[PDB]
């Protein structure tokens, strides 16, 4: 790969520069190169990996949503035949999005998840695995959709099981996993009651644990708790 000749430490340094410059594609490429050096990622490095790909796919998802909305309007009664272009361009963005998801999932499967034994790292990577399968599920229409949904649920569930055993309720990774799995239930899996139940129990159990939360993690965990409350307000 194009990053094979660069030192691991230089790749991490440049991922940090790319983040500051909001160059998320470059950030992701640097972090993929770092992962491919074959050493486990530290806690800070895991965050660089996740932020890079979250931002790349986030932009692709936003664009896909705009184009899918145009396409759906184009297929309603009274809409004028505008030819294949909207579908073609939506398919182009979709295929690029799928490619990025596949790249992330490949990194996770080789070999980040296999070698992650500490709960932080294992839950973190399984959450990512659930997230990228969820993004594939958002665009899946074919025979593939149910299997993709099942793959997302299986990753999120393994992460949930570990997080409940090994992390406190206010751990930010545990909270963010529960936030995203609740969104999976609501938006992907047609299980709004499960989504609401998960968000409420997560929020309530985190409140009761706030008295043990570190000042260093207060900001991250309270932000995620606010996002859980925002979703519950949207949903009820």
């Amino acid at each position: 790969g194009a990053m094979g000749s660069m030192e691991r430490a230089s790749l991490i340094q440049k991922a940090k520069l790319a983040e500051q410059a909001e160059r998320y594609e470059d950030m992701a490429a640097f972090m993929k190169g770092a992962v491919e050096k074959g050493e486990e990622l530290s806690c800070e490095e895991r965050n660089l990996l996740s932020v890079a790909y979250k931002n790349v796919v986030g932009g692709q998802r936003a664009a896909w949503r705009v184009l899918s909305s145009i396409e759906q309007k184009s297929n309603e009664e009274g809409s004028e035949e505008k030819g294949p272009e909207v579908r073609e361009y939506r398919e182009k963005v979709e295929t690029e999005l799928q490619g990025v998801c596949d790249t992330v999932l490949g990194l996770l499967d080789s070999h980040l998840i296999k070698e992650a034994g500490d709960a932080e790292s294992r839950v973190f990577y399984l959450k990512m695995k659930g997230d990228y399968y969820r993004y594939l599920a958002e665009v899946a229409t074919g025979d593939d959709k149910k299997r993709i949904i099942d793959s997302a649920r299986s990753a999120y569930q393994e992460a949930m099981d570990i997080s409940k055993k090994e992390m406190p309720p206010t751990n930010p990774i545990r909270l963010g996993l529960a936030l995203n799995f609740s969104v999976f239930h609501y938006e992907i899996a047609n299980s709004p009651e499960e989504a609401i139940s998960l968000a409420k129990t997560t929020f309530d159990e985190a409140m009761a644990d706030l008295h043990t939360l570190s000042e260093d993690s207060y900001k991250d965990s309270t932000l995620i708790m606010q996002l859980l409350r925002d979703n519950l307000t949207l949903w009820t």
């Binding site: 936030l179 609501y186 938006e187 995620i224 996002l227 979703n231 949207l234 949903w235």
Partner: peptide, 5 residues
């Protein structure tokens, strides 16, 4: 859309 992190 709902919030994720």
């Amino acid at each position: 859309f709902p919030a994720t992190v």
